[PDB]
Every structure is written in structure tokens, then in C-alpha cells.
């Protein structure tokens, strides 16, 4: 046989990116996976070449970031690529998970793939939070303080857990040093989970935007989806180059260029832009413990998703009401982000509570009821009696 | 020599099998190793 098939190392390259049978009807929404892989490689390479100049002391963190942006040759390129690419990493990941919810890729036989995806999502949120605290600006310090006090809400144990996390009594030098070590560490766990994700994908192949089988008309990976992914790679690099070179500090928060001061609290403490729906979910609950439980349940309710989709056809392509309520859900998630960006004021508390309820009601009540009604409507539309 | 004539194991067999004695001694030793491994892992 061929050398790409008989060699031990090149057989994986073959069976994953050369001769992988892909369904020939998949559109550009089946390209966000390759795009996330490229953006992860961007994050790791800029992280290494920018962490060769970073000193993680609490008295030397912000000065070393400014040393990168001023004294290091092309260091502004590195930091701006790194932060804005983390923003694009979460945006492409949100689009990828929306592709997962829409076309029904979570359903059987792809439950393992969906669960490893949710694990990757949790690890990526953790990585972004740790790296945002490594800047040690104003928002970095106070966001670390608020999230660890949320961990202090745990009954009978929590204060000692938080003194363990801090490595002291408040967010201090051991906290920033261990956040830098963990933040260097967790992306390699993300890379291992990505390899496990690709294995759980490869044992059944991709889905298709129709929700029927794709075993009939398969076309290879090579040259077809290689050049289709190359198209979206160049578009992604174009938009990233715009938001790096022409308007770099748009997505960030301007308070992060104030150095970390434990005495001055800011006027409005807000995380970076993508953690705002989860921050709104947590802020909508009038309790600390129930708030933390609801914030983690807002990700575990993605795990309870394949067991509630009672639709007998895969994906929302050929269904009306499920497609409508899907876009209700997407614009609700955007409204959660925008509620979280605001203050704790009338009527944003009541709207945050209603928006959290519509989030959990979509994942727990709306999907099974609308899928059951859509099944019975498909049946009685064509069966006569 | 037939395949029904089992060769000599009599130098290495127990003189008394007593299938609770031997299994209890073996599980005692495996449990002692698990005991000290639990202490060391803690």
C-alpha cells in the first residue's frame, strides 16, 4: 500500500486530515472546528513568545506587560494578537457550540463528543480567566477577588478553600504567581482534550445540515475541505488583523490599564466581554451559594441536552418552531451578556431573572415540548385516517 | 507418556489446600499493601 497508509505516524495524518470521509453537503458552519484549532495554535505560540518576557510578581506584572508593549520588538503585535485572539477564540467557540445546538450534533451516537466539548468549554473559560488575572490591572485584581469570594460561599469548608486558592489572605503575590503557573499549564490539558475530542468525532464522522445519513455520498478531506478551511482561515486572519492593527483596545475594558490597587474599588467591576452572560446568571440569583450553583448549572445544563431533545429527526433544519425558539435562545444569550454589562439597577434585576429563566426553560421545558409537538405535527400532516 | 499423566507438582503444592485459609492469607497480604498504599497516597 501507499506510504501514507503503511507508516505508523502518517496513518493518523491520513485518517484524520487526508482521507477522512466527510459528508459532501456540509456548509461553512462545519469549519469552525478547524478555525478553533488554528486559533488555539495562535494563542499558544503568542503565549510562549510573550511569556519569555513576563515576570509574574505582583509588583512586576503590569510593568512587565508594559515592557512587552514598549521595549520588546513587535511586542504590541504579540499582546494584541493574544488578547484579541482570545476574544475571537471565544467568539468562534460560541458559534461552534451554536452549530452544535442547531444541527443536532449532540444527539446519539455523538454524546461522548458533546460531553468532551463541554469539558473543553469549561477548561477554556478557566484558562481565559487565569490569563486575564495575570495582567494584574484593576479589573484583573477585583475580578479575581469577586470570583474567589464566590468560592467562599461553600458551606463549612469554603473559607479554607479560599485561603488555599489565594495562598494568603487576599489576592497577593502567591495568587498571581500560581495563576500564571496554572495559566501556562491548562492549555496543554485543553490540547489533550482536543485530541480526545477528535477521537470521539472520528469514530462516527461528522453530521450534515440535513439530519439524514451521509454514508452514501462521501468526499475525502483532501483538497476539498482543505481548501474550504483555507478560505475561512484567510477570512479569520483578515478580521483578526483588522481588530489587532486598527482598533486593538475595543474589546477590552479601559480600566485594565490602571495598575492593580487593592484599596480603590472601581466604579463598575465587569469581566471581559464573553463571561458576561454567566456573570449575569450568577448576579440574578439573590444568594451566594445558589448563585455559584446556578452558574455551574448553566454549563451542566448543556450536558442534560441530548436526553431532552425528543425530536425524531436530527437537527432544526426542517422544523419551524424549533428553529424559531433557537433564535429566541441565541438572542436571549446576547441579552444576558448585555444585562450583565449593566449595573444592579431597576429594571435590570428583573430582566436578568426573566432572562435566566428563559435560558433554563429553553434547555429544560421548551425543547422537549416543542419537539414532541413537532413530531405529532409531522405525523398527522401526512397520515390520513 | 500420555497427556492424562500430569507431571510432578508435589514439591510446590500445599499439603493442605483449605480454600478459605489460602484465600484469607492472600487477601490479608494484598489488603496490607492496599492499606499502606492508601496511607502513602494520603
Amino acid at each position: 500500500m501507499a506510504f501514507r497508509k503503511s507508516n505508523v505516524y502518517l496513518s493518523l495524518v491520513n485518517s484524520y486530515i487526508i482521507d477522512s470521509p466527510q459528508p459532501s453537503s456540509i456548509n461553512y458552519w462545519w469549519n469552525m472546528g478547524s478555525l478553533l484549532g488554528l486559533c488555539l495554535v495562535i494563542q499558544i505560540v503568542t503565549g510562549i513568545f510573550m511569556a519569555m518576557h513576563y515576570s509574574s510578581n505582583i509588583e512586576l506584572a503590569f510593568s512587565s506587560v508594559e515592557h512587552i508593549m514598549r521595549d520588546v520588538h513587535n511586542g504590541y503585535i504579540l499582546r494584541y494578537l493574544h488578547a484579541n485572539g482570545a476574544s475571537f477564540f471565544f467568539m468562534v467557540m460560541f458559534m461552534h457550540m451554536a452549530k452544535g445546538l442547531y444541527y443536532g450534533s449532540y444527539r446519539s451516537p455523538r454524546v461522548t463528543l458533546w460531553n468532551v466539548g463541554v469539558i473543553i468549554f469549561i477548561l477554556t473559560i478557566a484558562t481565559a480567566f487565569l490569563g486575564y488575572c495575570c495582567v494584574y490591572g484593576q479589573m484583573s485584581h477585583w475580578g479575581a477577588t469577586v470570583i474567589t469570594n464566590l468560592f467562599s460561599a461553600i458551606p463549612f469548608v469554603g473559607n479554607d478553600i479560599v485561603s488555599w486558592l489565594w495562598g494568603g489572605f487576599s489576592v497577593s503575590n502567591p495568587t498571581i504567581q500560581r495563576f500564571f503557573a496554572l495559566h501556562y499549564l491548562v492549555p496543554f490539558i485543553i490540547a489533550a482534550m482536543v485530541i480526545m475530542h477528535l477521537m470521539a468525532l472520528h469514530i462516527h464522522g461528522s453530521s450534515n445540515p440535513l439530519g439524514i445519513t451521509g454514508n452514501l455520498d462521501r468526499i475525502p478531506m483532501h483538497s476539498y475541505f482543505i481548501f474550504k478551511d483555507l478560505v475561512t482561515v484567510f477570512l479569520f486572519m483578515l478580521i483578526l488583523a483588522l481588530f489587532v492593527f486598527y482598533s486593538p483596545n475595543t474589546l477590552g475594558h479601559p480600566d485594565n490599564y490602571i495598575p492593580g490597587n487593592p484599596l480603590v474599588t472601581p466604579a463598575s467591576i465587569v469581566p471581559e466581554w464573553y463571561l458576561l452572560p454567566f456573570y449575569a446568571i450568577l448576579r440574578s440569583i439573590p444568594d451566594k451559594l445558589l448563585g455559584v450553583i446556578t452558574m455551574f448549572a448553566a454549563i451542566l445544563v448543556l450536558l442534560v441536552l441530548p436526553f431532552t431533545d425528543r425530536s425524531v429527526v436530527r437537527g432544526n433544519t426542517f422544523k419551524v418552531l424549533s428553529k424559531f425558539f433557537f433564535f429566541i435562545f441565541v438572542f436571549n444569550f446576547v441579552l444576558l451578556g448585555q444585562i450583565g454589562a449593566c449595573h444592579v439597577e431597576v429594571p435590570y434585576v428583573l430582566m436578568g431573572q426573566i432572562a435566566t429563566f428563559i435560558y433554563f426553560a429553553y434547555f429544560l421545558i421548551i425543547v422537549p415540548v416543542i419537539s414532541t409537538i413537532e413530531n405529532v405535527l409531522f405525523y398527522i400532516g401526512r397520515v390520513n385516517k | 507418556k500420555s497427556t492424562y499423566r500430569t507431571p510432578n507438582f508435589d514439591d510446590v503444592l500445599k499439603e493442605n489446600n483449605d480454600a478459605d485459609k489460602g484465600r484469607s492469607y492472600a487477601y490479608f497480604m494484598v489488603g496490607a499493601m492496599g492499606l499502606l498504599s492508601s496511607a502513602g497516597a494520603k
Binding site: - | 484465600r23 484469607s24 487477601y27 489488603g31 492496599g34 492499606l35 492508601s38
Partner: protein, 54 residues
Amino acid sequence: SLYKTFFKRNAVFVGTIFAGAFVFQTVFDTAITSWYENHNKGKLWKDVKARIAA
């Protein structure tokens, strides 16, 4: 059969392992601390604190 019901279920087997490991940690810590202090009597700091009475 007298001890084998004490080994039959794996639940009571690992429960015995964890109970014995708890007791072993406590007793072994106390015993090694006592022997290590007894072997070096006259050199530890509580001995010098007892001798220097001023």
C-alpha cells in the same frame, strides 16, 4: 469461612482498608515522633528550655 465473609464483599474489604489506614496514620505518626524524640533526648529545644530556667 470464619474470615471469608469479612473478605467476601469488596465494600467491607475496602472499608477495612480505609479504617486500618486511618488508624495506621495516627499510630505511626505518634510512635515515630515519640521514638525520634526519645533517641535525641537532651538535644531538642524543650530540653534546653527546661535546663535554661532563667
